[model samples]
Target: KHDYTNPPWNAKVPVQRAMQWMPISQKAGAAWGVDPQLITAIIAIESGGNPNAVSKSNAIGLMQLKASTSGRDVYRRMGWSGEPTTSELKNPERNISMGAAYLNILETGPLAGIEDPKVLQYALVVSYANGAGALLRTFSSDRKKAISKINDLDADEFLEHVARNHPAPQAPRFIYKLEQALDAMLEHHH
Candidate 1:
């Protein structure tokens, strides 16, 4: 039988690697009020659980967070005074912590107007790869108008809308990978 929601990506190795960080992810999730499986999915997609991974854009560690952007935001949100350094982000615990914080920032800040829980999840996944402004701009230039338009969409409609309309070409595929990884993590209990 085919499982549409949990479509396979042959992600065994990445999923296996992600399992090692579950404790850290769960901790961050609990602290930030994000989901552990979502954090696990990001770990699988971002760095494949490699603490030493560095992107060409200089995103670092298990969640591939760029210090200047996501890291700085996390710091500010936590009422901390300074931005994280590269070395700090390379620590798996710190990276996942900041990544989860960034997600919370998105949820409570730019993406706050989203009404449905499932739609909010889709929006967060899209906004993580693309910017929240970019995601909102897909529907309208005005933020309130855009959110009003977004609220009209159901979860599947929101996913399809984003996959079709998000500016980044990779955004759609990133959401797919996250969903698949999230399902795998939940089903596997890791």
Candidate 2:
């Protein structure tokens, strides 16, 4: 159901071969609120479709997840009674499922009340890359007044504000990465 020849995301080797996981990703997306290809887009950027991938910081599988948090921790958070191992993170279905679940939490959890599409996108992408705490702090202008006028700001202003508040440089670039992945997914599907 996926296009290997024109698989969306980056042009890296694994991404060009990313179609193999489309079925699983699409299935996971069906259960989750997100689109299948959006999961694909995230995996492509995170690990280039390599289920065996291991990041420098030890994020494993298709999602490049860390063992400490993404693995055992996430499993616990999901109320999985059994313990999860680092090796289990290499399983594509399991990894993608957890990643999609986390994405759902980020979208419909604390970010659920947020309405602006752009703001929500920014929060999801940034929070996905970093953490929700960091995303929240990114808008914390004062100790008490956080996001009081966030929705009022224009996209340009919000972007600038995020830049000023967020410490990591890659967080901003993450927006473009998600955009490219979504665009490619649309174009390929179209």
Candidate 3:
């Protein structure tokens, strides 16, 4: 299994302690019909459960909301009247809530495209990494051809192709890396 203690993110807290936030993440995930395990994985990879984490992509806090956009969109969806401040986004509860809500929208929202929840999972994750609009663009003939290589490949090969050719360079890697995080998190449970 991968090392949870020293994940790619610079974890400011110990892995064991990081899990203390699971209940909070679970509460948020449940409201959006998201698996809490995925929430844990997001925290593990995005910030190593560190609430203080920040990224140049405007990703911030535990689940790393793109404060200017994703966070605002989340606010609108959640019936909040205004955008969330950096400090509020840094709060684990607010961050996970909005992040999970966004995942819900990506999973089942109008532009999500398709009926299978499993396919929706992949689409949502990619949409989360890139953007729903960008991921949706692949449905057109030209872009679909570029991603068609992944349809028949094994997992590693699939990831390799997508990493090389997907609209967002890290989109596929993000999925597997979070899978790794989820695997590690589940392993830690036992």
Measured by TM-score, the strongest candidate is: 1
Q: How does each model score on lDDT?
A: 0.83, 0.68, 0.67
lDDT of 3 by residue, 34-124 (tens): 8777777677766777898999876888888987788888888878887899989898898888889988876666334354444555556
RMSD of each: 3.7, 6.4, 5.1
User: Candidate 3 has what TM-score?
Assistant: 0.76
Q: After superposition, how far is residue 89 of candidate 1 from its true place, in Å?
A: 0.4
Over 1-190, each residue of candidate 2 has an lDDT whose tens digit, in order, gives: 1122233335344444455688888878788766676677678777888899887887888877776765655667678765456678889998888787777877776566665776776666777777766766766745234445566676556666666677766666666566666655654552
The order by descending TM-score is 1, 2, 3
Using Cα atoms with residue i matched to residue i, what is each candidate's TM-score against the true structure? 0.91, 0.79, 0.76
Better of 1 and 2 by lDDT: 1
lDDT of 1 by residue, 1-190 (tens): 1122344465567977988899998999999999888888888887888889999989889988888888888999989987899989988898899999999999999999788987888788778877899989989999989999999999878778876777676566666787677667766744
Q: Show where candidate 1 strays beyond 4 Å.
A: 1-8
Query: How accurate locally is residue 122 in candidate 2, as Cα lDDT from 0 to 100?
Result: 66
